[PDB]
From a paper:
Proliferating cell nuclear antigen ([name]) is a fundamental protein involved in maintaining genome integrity, with roles in both DNA replication and repair. [name] is a trimeric, ring-shaped molecule with pseudo-hexagonal symmetry that can accommodate double-stranded DNA through a central pore. [name] and other processivity factors tether polymerases to DNA to increase their processivity and are commonly referred to as sliding clamps. Each processivity factor monomer possesses one binding pocket for a PIP-box bearing protein.
To investigate the halophilic adaptation of such a key protein we have crystallised and solved the structure of [name] [name] (HvPCNA) to a resolution of 2.0 Å. The crystal structure of HvPCNA was solved to 2.0 Å resolution and contains one trimer in the asymmetric unit. The overall architecture is very similar to other known [name] structures, as expected. 274 water molecules and nine sodium ions are modelled in the asymmetric unit. Analysis using the PISA server shows that the buried surface area at the HvPCNA interface is relatively small at 1160 Å2 (averaged over the ncs related subunits). HvPCNA also has a relatively small interface and so forms just five main chain hydrogen bonds, with further side chain interactions involving Asp172 OD2 with Tyr106 OH and Ala109 N. The net charge, calculated assuming histidines to be neutral, of HvPCNA is -31, considerably higher than the remaining [name] structures (-13 to -20). HvPCNA is markedly different from typical sliding clamps, with almost total loss of the usual positive surface charge in the inner pore. Examination of the inner ring reveals that HvPCNA possesses only two basic residues (per monomer), Lys143 and Lys205, that extend into the channel and are likely to contribute significantly to the postulated water-mediated interactions with the phosphate backbone of DNA passing through the pore. The principle cation binding site is located around a carboxylate cluster (Asp146, Asp150 and Asp198), towards the inner edge of the ring and appears to contain two Na+ ions coordinated by the carboxylate groups, water molecules and main chain carbonyls.
Author numbering:
A (entry chain C): 2 to 80, 83 to 243
B (entry chain B): 2 to 90, 96 to 123, 127 to 243
C (entry chain A): 2 to 28, 32 to 59, 65 to 80, 85 to 89, 97 to 108, 112 to 115, 120 to 243
Write the structure that this text describes.
Amino acid sequence: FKAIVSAATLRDALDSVSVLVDECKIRLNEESLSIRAVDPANVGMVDLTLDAAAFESYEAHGGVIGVNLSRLEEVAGMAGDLIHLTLDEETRKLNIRIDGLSYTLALIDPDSIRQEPDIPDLDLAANIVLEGTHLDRGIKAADMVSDHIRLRVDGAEETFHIEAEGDTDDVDLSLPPADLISIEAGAADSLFSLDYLKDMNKAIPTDAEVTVELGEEFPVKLHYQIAEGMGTITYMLAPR
Amino acid sequence: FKAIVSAATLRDALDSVSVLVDECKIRLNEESLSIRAVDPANVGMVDLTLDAAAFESYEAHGGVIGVNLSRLEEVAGMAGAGDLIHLTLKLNIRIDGLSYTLALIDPDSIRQEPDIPLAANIVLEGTHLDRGIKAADMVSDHIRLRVDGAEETFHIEAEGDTDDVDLSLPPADLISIEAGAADSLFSLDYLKDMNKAIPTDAEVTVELGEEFPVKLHYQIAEGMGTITYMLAPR
Amino acid sequence: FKAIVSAATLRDALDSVSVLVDECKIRESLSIRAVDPANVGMVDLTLDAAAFESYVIGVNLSRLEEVAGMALIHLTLNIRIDGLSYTLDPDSPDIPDLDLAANIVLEGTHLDRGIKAADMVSDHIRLRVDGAEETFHIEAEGDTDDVDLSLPPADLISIEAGAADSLFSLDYLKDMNKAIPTDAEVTVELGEEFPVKLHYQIAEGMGTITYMLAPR
Ligand code: NA
Ligand code: NA
Ligand code: NA
Ligand code: NA
Ligand code: NA
Ligand code: NA
Ligand code: NA
Ligand code: NA
Ligand code: NA
């Protein structure tokens, strides 16, 4: 495995996974690098695919490696620098080089890291595409009154609602179609742990458009792209 | 009660009160919105007047409501300073597509509102009160405000154990002064926190005496609100 | 005494010493020399008259800093910065001359960078020269991971590449580095299990600071 990737690219990519886990398996496939992981509680799941085209250079033959993702993140943080990634299959180390700086990261046996989850294909009733700013905002407001967040469609009005109910205060971010990028307004109303949804949203880069798949008392999925399109990230969040 | 007001106004308005108390009565008046409070130690008092002309729209009709200030503040915090906040009487607060329902409080459940009841008068640029307060704090938790009449000169000063400090503001560094005898000692932390609430460029009027409370006055909302603080002497 | 000094020049001055001790002795020029409670780190600051617009006491150093942050500072302890008047016993080290085998001149950024990377893996930092390749390394070794900022000639200001490889407390090197201005050129003298010295200038080359740090 050997690759050369832009600093912002890799940091956006590892940021998504690091929201849920501190160690992960990276699949080093011939035409993309991917990571999929579930958290310990089985409440959140992430699926990253970063196409070969996102790299300035990418060469991989199908291996899998196990990494301390918090260390590897800290390292990628030292970098518009390029980050050079080279695996030593012999010593089981990943060399990361950024200019003259060379960091040798000892791999972890993948068999020792949480089994990769299957993110189930769902046919949830509603689909909402919107600017990430709205999800930031609604999550900030909700956090004021509760640690639970409700995502709800008004199917008639084609309006997406991010809301929460506290002991006496309530909040409601109402997003009719003029504040959306698109909506299929099927029946949808689910409640989630706010903190998970907020950490997730925090990894989404600030100008990204987010796709939300939402039903009634089911998990929510969120999809977005990074690397000008050549990477895609999907989160899935179980309802509470 | 129905009012629409700019974010930066309401924030400036609530900040002055928040400095001193966590809840307050807001008197909803026909021509103006007003709050007055005193802290629990009964040492600092604030009096805010928010006139109609500060609200884009403002209709009120004599009521009064009790409010948890921290929360209403955090809510207003959510707007673009440019954004309008819609207030409608629980109090409903809407900002762009965001609506918040804030449960009032029994006004009778709150500390009685004070009324704010001097030889020198000093108008200066808030920036000198910042500096003066910051310097003084390095050396002490008591801060002395003193006029040197002859010299028509305002001093913000403090005496260490080891060290002292003195910010001397003669006429050139003042907006104007009526330099009556005045020399009075205060809790620096009360003055500092009050100061913290004053906007960066506001002009501040200080009334000062000899062993007497100090008052500070300044304007918000480009002129349509007025805030008075009074702080008891030591 | 009486002086009139640039705020930014006097802050960079006092910073280099403040980093090592909370209190100190001030003495053609101004100077301070102190070594830290553990006798491990030392500083020798020298400010030339020309660093001063106009130009032995024993100062409380963290307070002088706090006052200088209110800012030309007039020094007459009595301090004045515009309208601001602040009123604030020396009996209350030998930096050896070494001919350390190596001498490296480099941009400050590099040393920042090497220390930040080393810190992710250890609280010990290694400074090493590769004589052959005239390449300065800043490196660390962890429980399982390693880092090496390798700085060949192309990435240096100068190098006299003697044999040298010494190990140090990263926290003290990191504190020292804190006070060094962001675009300073730093000269390092280095040998084989010996103290390191760092030299840099302030006040436009009007001021010179030396640090020395004992090895581990
Ligand atoms: Na669907
Ligand atoms: Na919360
Ligand atoms: Na919480
Ligand atoms: Na008067
Ligand atoms: Na103080
Ligand atoms: Na204090
Ligand atoms: Na030498
Ligand atoms: Na460390
Ligand atoms: Na450490």
